[PDB]
Nucleic acid binder design. Structure first.
Ligand SMILES: [Zn+2]
Length: 56
RNA sequence: UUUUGCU
């Protein structure tokens, strides 16, 4: 696959209180057990790799 | 809406 870093302006690095984000919690839905990267509410699947919807 | 969490 292709992967290239374009340009940047304001670097990222969010870190300032997270309620109680547990090491075994989700920072997406707020679920306990799965990770955000494993959140079943992620813009992935079942078919159609394209986040950020356009039409309602 | 929420990935603000090292492989
Ligand atoms: Zn989740």
């Amino acid at each position: 696959a292709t992967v290239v870093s374009g340009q940047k302006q304001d670097r990222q690095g969010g870190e300032r209180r997270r309620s109680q984000l547990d090491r075994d919690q989700c920072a997406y839905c707020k679920e306990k057990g799965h990770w955000a990267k494993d959140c079943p509410k992620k813009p992935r699947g079942p078919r159609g790799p394209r986040p950020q919807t356009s039409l309602l």
